[PDB]
Structure 1
Amino acid sequence: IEQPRWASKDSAAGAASTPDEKIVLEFMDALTSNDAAKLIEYFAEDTMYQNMPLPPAYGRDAVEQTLAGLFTVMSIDAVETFHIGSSNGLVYTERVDVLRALPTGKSYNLSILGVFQLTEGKITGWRDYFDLREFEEAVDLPLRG
Protein backbone atom coordinates (compact mmCIF):
# COMPACT_ATOMS: atom_id res chain seq x y z
CA ILE A 1 0.00 0.00 0.00
CA GLU A 2 1.69 3.21 -1.11
CA GLN A 3 0.83 6.47 0.78
CA PRO A 4 -1.10 8.85 -1.54
CA ARG A 5 0.34 12.32 -2.16
CA TRP A 6 -2.83 13.82 -0.78
CA ALA A 7 -2.95 11.69 2.41
CA SER A 8 -2.34 13.39 5.74
CA LYS A 9 0.97 12.59 7.38
CA ASP A 10 -0.36 13.92 10.73
CA SER A 11 0.02 11.51 13.64
CA ALA A 12 -3.72 11.66 14.31
CA ALA A 13 -4.72 11.03 10.65
CA GLY A 14 -6.68 7.83 10.48
CA ALA A 15 -6.92 7.66 14.28
CA ALA A 16 -10.23 7.30 16.08
CA SER A 17 -11.40 10.38 18.02
CA THR A 18 -14.78 9.06 19.20
CA PRO A 19 -16.27 5.75 20.39
CA ASP A 20 -17.97 5.20 17.00
CA GLU A 21 -14.73 5.84 15.15
CA LYS A 22 -12.99 3.38 17.44
CA ILE A 23 -15.60 0.66 16.63
CA VAL A 24 -15.20 1.38 12.88
CA LEU A 25 -11.40 0.98 13.01
CA GLU A 26 -11.83 -2.28 15.02
CA PHE A 27 -14.18 -3.42 12.24
CA MET A 28 -11.57 -2.52 9.61
CA ASP A 29 -8.98 -4.64 11.43
CA ALA A 30 -11.54 -7.48 11.46
CA LEU A 31 -12.10 -7.39 7.69
CA THR A 32 -8.85 -9.35 7.08
CA SER A 33 -10.54 -12.31 8.86
CA ASN A 34 -12.51 -12.96 5.64
CA ASP A 35 -15.11 -14.39 8.05
CA ALA A 36 -18.71 -13.29 7.60
CA ALA A 37 -19.86 -14.92 10.87
CA LYS A 38 -17.28 -12.85 12.81
CA LEU A 39 -18.15 -9.64 10.97
CA ILE A 40 -21.91 -9.90 11.26
CA GLU A 41 -21.65 -9.49 15.06
CA TYR A 42 -20.85 -5.79 14.43
CA PHE A 43 -24.27 -5.26 12.83
CA ALA A 44 -27.65 -4.29 14.26
CA GLU A 45 -30.73 -6.32 13.14
CA ASP A 46 -32.22 -3.32 11.30
CA THR A 47 -29.18 -2.79 9.09
CA MET A 48 -27.92 -2.61 5.56
CA TYR A 49 -24.69 -3.04 3.55
CA GLN A 50 -23.90 -1.92 0.06
CA ASN A 51 -20.91 -1.86 -2.22
CA MET A 52 -22.32 1.00 -4.23
CA PRO A 53 -21.66 -0.46 -7.73
CA LEU A 54 -23.90 -3.37 -6.72
CA PRO A 55 -27.36 -3.82 -5.14
CA PRO A 56 -27.83 -3.26 -1.42
CA ALA A 57 -28.47 -5.86 1.22
CA TYR A 58 -31.13 -5.14 3.82
CA GLY A 59 -31.38 -6.93 7.15
CA ARG A 60 -28.74 -8.79 9.00
CA ASP A 61 -29.21 -12.16 7.20
CA ALA A 62 -28.90 -10.62 3.69
CA VAL A 63 -25.77 -8.77 4.87
CA GLU A 64 -24.20 -11.92 6.22
CA GLN A 65 -25.00 -13.92 3.08
CA THR A 66 -23.54 -11.14 0.92
CA LEU A 67 -20.29 -11.09 2.92
CA ALA A 68 -20.05 -14.88 2.85
CA GLY A 69 -20.43 -14.79 -0.92
CA LEU A 70 -17.85 -12.08 -1.33
CA PHE A 71 -15.36 -14.01 0.80
CA THR A 72 -15.86 -17.07 -1.40
CA VAL A 73 -14.43 -15.15 -4.37
CA MET A 74 -11.90 -12.77 -2.80
CA SER A 75 -9.66 -12.23 0.24
CA ILE A 76 -9.15 -8.85 1.91
CA ASP A 77 -5.42 -9.17 2.50
CA ALA A 78 -4.92 -5.67 4.02
CA VAL A 79 -6.81 -2.46 4.86
CA GLU A 80 -5.24 0.88 5.45
CA THR A 81 -7.30 3.82 6.53
CA PHE A 82 -5.65 7.13 5.56
CA HIS A 83 -8.43 9.35 6.97
CA ILE A 84 -11.32 8.90 9.39
CA GLY A 85 -13.87 11.41 10.55
CA SER A 86 -17.42 11.65 11.80
CA SER A 87 -20.42 13.83 12.51
CA ASN A 88 -24.01 13.31 13.54
CA GLY A 89 -23.95 9.49 13.82
CA LEU A 90 -21.95 8.82 10.64
CA VAL A 91 -18.31 7.79 10.33
CA TYR A 92 -16.35 8.20 7.09
CA THR A 93 -13.18 6.26 6.11
CA GLU A 94 -10.86 7.07 3.19
CA ARG A 95 -8.87 3.90 2.63
CA VAL A 96 -7.29 1.32 0.41
CA ASP A 97 -8.31 -2.34 0.60
CA VAL A 98 -5.88 -4.88 -0.87
CA LEU A 99 -8.08 -7.54 -2.53
CA ARG A 100 -7.01 -10.87 -3.98
CA ALA A 101 -9.34 -12.74 -6.38
CA LEU A 102 -9.32 -16.38 -5.36
CA PRO A 103 -10.06 -17.78 -8.91
CA THR A 104 -7.13 -16.01 -10.52
CA GLY A 105 -4.67 -15.29 -7.75
CA LYS A 106 -4.38 -11.65 -8.88
CA SER A 107 -4.53 -8.71 -6.48
CA TYR A 108 -5.52 -5.05 -6.66
CA ASN A 109 -5.30 -2.09 -4.33
CA LEU A 110 -8.82 -0.67 -4.30
CA SER A 111 -9.31 3.00 -3.35
CA ILE A 112 -12.49 3.35 -1.26
CA LEU A 113 -14.41 6.02 0.56
CA GLY A 114 -16.92 4.47 2.92
CA VAL A 115 -19.59 5.62 5.35
CA PHE A 116 -20.84 3.80 8.49
CA GLN A 117 -23.98 4.58 10.53
CA LEU A 118 -23.87 3.26 14.10
CA THR A 119 -26.72 3.08 16.61
CA GLU A 120 -25.72 2.11 20.19
CA GLY A 121 -22.34 0.90 18.88
CA LYS A 122 -23.81 -1.43 16.19
CA ILE A 123 -23.76 -0.90 12.41
CA THR A 124 -27.08 0.20 10.97
CA GLY A 125 -25.56 1.00 7.58
CA TRP A 126 -22.25 0.52 5.75
CA ARG A 127 -21.79 1.82 2.24
CA ASP A 128 -18.47 1.70 0.36
CA TYR A 129 -17.93 3.81 -2.74
CA PHE A 130 -15.36 2.87 -5.40
CA ASP A 131 -15.04 1.98 -9.08
CA LEU A 132 -15.78 -1.66 -9.78
CA ARG A 133 -14.59 -1.87 -13.39
CA GLU A 134 -10.95 -1.08 -12.62
CA PHE A 135 -10.91 -3.86 -9.99
CA GLU A 136 -12.58 -6.40 -12.30
CA GLU A 137 -10.05 -5.64 -15.07
CA ALA A 138 -7.02 -5.87 -12.74
CA VAL A 139 -7.92 -9.29 -11.37
CA ASP A 140 -9.85 -10.88 -14.28
CA LEU A 141 -12.94 -11.42 -12.17
CA PRO A 142 -16.19 -9.99 -13.67
CA LEU A 143 -17.94 -9.49 -10.30
CA ARG A 144 -20.71 -7.65 -12.00
CA GLY A 145 -19.17 -7.64 -15.53
Structure 2
Amino acid sequence: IEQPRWASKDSAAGAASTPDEKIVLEFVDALTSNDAAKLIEYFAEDTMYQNMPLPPAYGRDAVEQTLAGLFTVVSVDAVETFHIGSSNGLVYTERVDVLRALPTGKSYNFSILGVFQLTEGKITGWRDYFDLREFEEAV
Protein backbone atom coordinates (compact mmCIF):
# COMPACT_ATOMS: atom_id res chain seq x y z
CA ILE A 1 0.00 0.00 0.00
CA GLU A 2 2.33 2.78 1.15
CA GLN A 3 6.05 3.10 0.63
CA PRO A 4 8.13 1.25 3.22
CA ARG A 5 10.78 3.22 5.05
CA TRP A 6 13.62 1.14 3.52
CA ALA A 7 12.46 1.85 -0.01
CA SER A 8 15.30 3.25 -2.09
CA LYS A 9 14.41 5.58 -4.92
CA ASP A 10 17.62 4.48 -6.66
CA SER A 11 15.98 1.15 -7.40
CA ALA A 12 12.33 2.17 -7.77
CA ALA A 13 10.06 0.45 -10.24
CA GLY A 14 9.75 3.63 -12.28
CA ALA A 15 13.55 3.62 -12.67
CA ALA A 16 13.59 0.31 -14.57
CA SER A 17 16.35 0.64 -17.14
CA THR A 18 17.04 -2.62 -18.96
CA PRO A 19 14.72 -4.45 -21.32
CA ASP A 20 14.55 -7.44 -18.93
CA GLU A 21 13.61 -5.23 -16.00
CA LYS A 22 10.87 -3.59 -18.02
CA ILE A 23 9.52 -6.96 -19.14
CA VAL A 24 9.44 -8.36 -15.60
CA LEU A 25 7.85 -5.13 -14.29
CA GLU A 26 5.14 -5.40 -16.95
CA PHE A 27 4.68 -9.08 -16.09
CA VAL A 28 4.17 -8.67 -12.33
CA ASP A 29 1.75 -5.80 -12.99
CA ALA A 30 -0.16 -8.14 -15.30
CA LEU A 31 -0.75 -10.52 -12.37
CA THR A 32 -3.86 -8.46 -11.47
CA SER A 33 -5.39 -9.69 -14.71
CA ASN A 34 -5.98 -13.06 -13.00
CA ASP A 35 -5.69 -14.50 -16.49
CA ALA A 36 -3.46 -17.53 -16.92
CA ALA A 37 -3.82 -17.43 -20.73
CA LYS A 38 -2.56 -13.87 -20.83
CA LEU A 39 0.25 -14.54 -18.35
CA ILE A 40 1.57 -17.73 -19.91
CA GLU A 41 2.57 -15.82 -23.08
CA TYR A 42 5.42 -14.31 -21.04
CA PHE A 43 6.96 -17.74 -20.48
CA ALA A 44 9.47 -19.74 -22.50
CA GLU A 45 8.79 -23.40 -23.31
CA ASP A 46 11.63 -24.44 -21.02
CA THR A 47 10.62 -22.66 -17.85
CA MET A 48 9.93 -22.97 -14.16
CA TYR A 49 7.76 -21.32 -11.52
CA GLN A 50 7.96 -21.83 -7.77
CA ASN A 51 6.72 -20.38 -4.52
CA MET A 52 9.65 -21.35 -2.33
CA PRO A 53 9.90 -24.01 -1.11
CA LEU A 54 6.68 -25.62 -2.45
CA PRO A 55 7.02 -28.17 -5.29
CA PRO A 56 8.09 -26.37 -8.44
CA ALA A 57 6.36 -26.36 -11.78
CA TYR A 58 8.68 -27.07 -14.70
CA GLY A 59 7.57 -26.64 -18.28
CA ARG A 60 5.14 -24.14 -19.69
CA ASP A 61 2.13 -26.51 -19.40
CA ALA A 62 2.67 -27.10 -15.70
CA VAL A 63 3.20 -23.37 -15.10
CA GLU A 64 0.00 -22.52 -16.96
CA GLN A 65 -1.93 -25.10 -14.95
CA THR A 66 -0.55 -23.74 -11.70
CA LEU A 67 -1.53 -20.17 -12.51
CA ALA A 68 -4.96 -21.22 -13.82
CA GLY A 69 -5.58 -23.09 -10.58
CA LEU A 70 -4.39 -20.20 -8.44
CA PHE A 71 -6.84 -17.87 -10.13
CA THR A 72 -9.76 -20.18 -9.42
CA VAL A 73 -9.35 -19.69 -5.66
CA VAL A 74 -7.61 -16.34 -5.40
CA SER A 75 -7.69 -12.89 -6.91
CA VAL A 76 -4.52 -10.86 -7.16
CA ASP A 77 -6.04 -7.53 -6.20
CA ALA A 78 -2.84 -5.49 -6.25
CA VAL A 79 0.85 -5.64 -6.93
CA GLU A 80 3.02 -2.87 -5.53
CA THR A 81 6.64 -3.10 -6.64
CA PHE A 82 9.06 -1.22 -4.41
CA HIS A 83 12.35 -2.22 -6.06
CA ILE A 84 13.40 -3.70 -9.29
CA GLY A 85 16.96 -4.46 -10.32
CA SER A 86 18.99 -6.95 -12.27
CA SER A 87 22.36 -8.63 -12.26
CA ASN A 88 24.05 -11.46 -14.19
CA GLY A 89 20.91 -12.38 -16.16
CA LEU A 90 18.59 -12.36 -13.15
CA VAL A 91 15.91 -9.80 -12.41
CA TYR A 92 14.81 -9.08 -8.81
CA THR A 93 11.51 -7.61 -7.64
CA GLU A 94 10.92 -6.58 -4.04
CA ARG A 95 7.20 -6.15 -3.82
CA VAL A 96 3.87 -6.73 -2.14
CA ASP A 97 1.13 -8.84 -3.66
CA VAL A 98 -2.37 -8.44 -2.29
CA LEU A 99 -4.33 -11.67 -2.62
CA ARG A 100 -8.05 -12.10 -2.00
CA ALA A 101 -9.43 -15.55 -1.27
CA LEU A 102 -12.49 -15.91 -3.49
CA PRO A 103 -14.51 -18.22 -1.25
CA THR A 104 -14.04 -16.12 1.92
CA GLY A 105 -13.49 -12.61 0.66
CA LYS A 106 -10.49 -12.33 2.97
CA SER A 107 -7.47 -10.47 1.68
CA TYR A 108 -3.80 -11.06 2.48
CA ASN A 109 -0.68 -8.89 2.11
CA PHE A 110 2.38 -10.91 1.03
CA SER A 111 5.85 -9.32 1.20
CA ILE A 112 7.66 -10.99 -1.68
CA LEU A 113 11.14 -10.99 -3.12
CA GLY A 114 11.07 -12.67 -6.51
CA VAL A 115 13.80 -13.65 -8.88
CA PHE A 116 13.28 -13.98 -12.61
CA GLN A 117 15.51 -15.44 -15.30
CA LEU A 118 14.79 -14.38 -18.86
CA THR A 119 15.95 -15.95 -22.12
CA GLU A 120 15.36 -13.92 -25.27
CA GLY A 121 12.79 -11.88 -23.38
CA LYS A 122 10.84 -14.93 -22.21
CA ILE A 123 10.63 -16.21 -18.63
CA THR A 124 12.91 -19.22 -18.11
CA GLY A 125 12.63 -19.22 -14.29
CA TRP A 126 10.47 -17.45 -11.71
CA ARG A 127 10.89 -18.04 -7.97
CA ASP A 128 8.99 -16.03 -5.37
CA TYR A 129 10.21 -15.94 -1.79
CA PHE A 130 7.83 -14.99 0.98
CA ASP A 131 6.15 -16.12 4.18
CA LEU A 132 3.74 -18.98 3.51
CA ARG A 133 2.07 -19.05 6.96
CA GLU A 134 -1.04 -17.34 5.59
CA PHE A 135 -0.58 -18.57 2.01
CA GLU A 136 -2.02 -21.96 2.99
CA GLU A 137 -5.20 -20.41 4.38
CA ALA A 138 -5.44 -18.14 1.35
CA VAL A 139 -5.16 -21.44 -0.61
Shorter-chain TM-score tier: over 0.9
> Normalising to structure 1: TM-score of the pair?
0.89
Post-superposition offset of 1:83 = 0.5
CA separation of 1:42 and 1:11: change in aligned 2, threshold 3 A: closer
Post-superposition offset of 1:109 = 1.1
**C-alpha distance in structure 1 between counterparts of 2:59 and 2:35, whole Å:** 18
For structure 1, the residue ranges without an aligned partner over 5 or more in a row are: 140-145
How big is each residue's C-alpha offset from its partner over 1:94-130, in whole Å with a ceiling of 9 and x where there is no partner? Answer: 0000110111100011100000000000000000000
CA separation of 1:3 and 1:136: change in aligned 2, threshold 3 A: farther
**C-alpha distance in structure 2 between counterparts of 1:27 and 1:113, whole Å:** 15
Secondary structure, counterpart of 1:137 in structure 2: coil
How many positions carry a matched residue from both structures?
139
Query: What does residue 41 of structure 2 align with?
Result: 41
Query: What does residue 14 of structure 1 align with?
Result: 14
**C-alpha distance in structure 2 between counterparts of 1:78 and 1:136, whole Å:** 19
**C-alpha distance in structure 2 between counterparts of 1:12 and 1:136, whole Å:** 30
Post-superposition offset of 1:136 = 4.0
CA separation of 1:7 and 1:27: change in aligned 2, threshold 3 A: same
**2:42–2:123 CA contact under 8 A, matched in 1:** yes
For structure 2, the residue ranges without an aligned partner over 5 or more in a row are: none
**C-alpha distance in structure 2 between counterparts of 1:13 and 1:59, whole Å:** 28
Q: Which shows bigger deviation, 98-107 or 129-138?
A: 129-138
**1:14–1:82 CA contact under 8 A, matched in 2:** no
CA RMSD, aligned part only?
A: 1.8
> Normalising to structure 2: TM-score of the pair?
0.93
**1:14–1:81 CA contact under 8 A, matched in 2:** no
Percentage of identical aligned residues? 97
Query: What does residue 100 of structure 2 align with?
Result: 100
**C-alpha distance in structure 2 between counterparts of 1:14 and 1:117, whole Å:** 20
Post-superposition offset of 1:15 = 2.6
CA separation of 1:39 and 1:138: change in aligned 2, threshold 3 A: closer
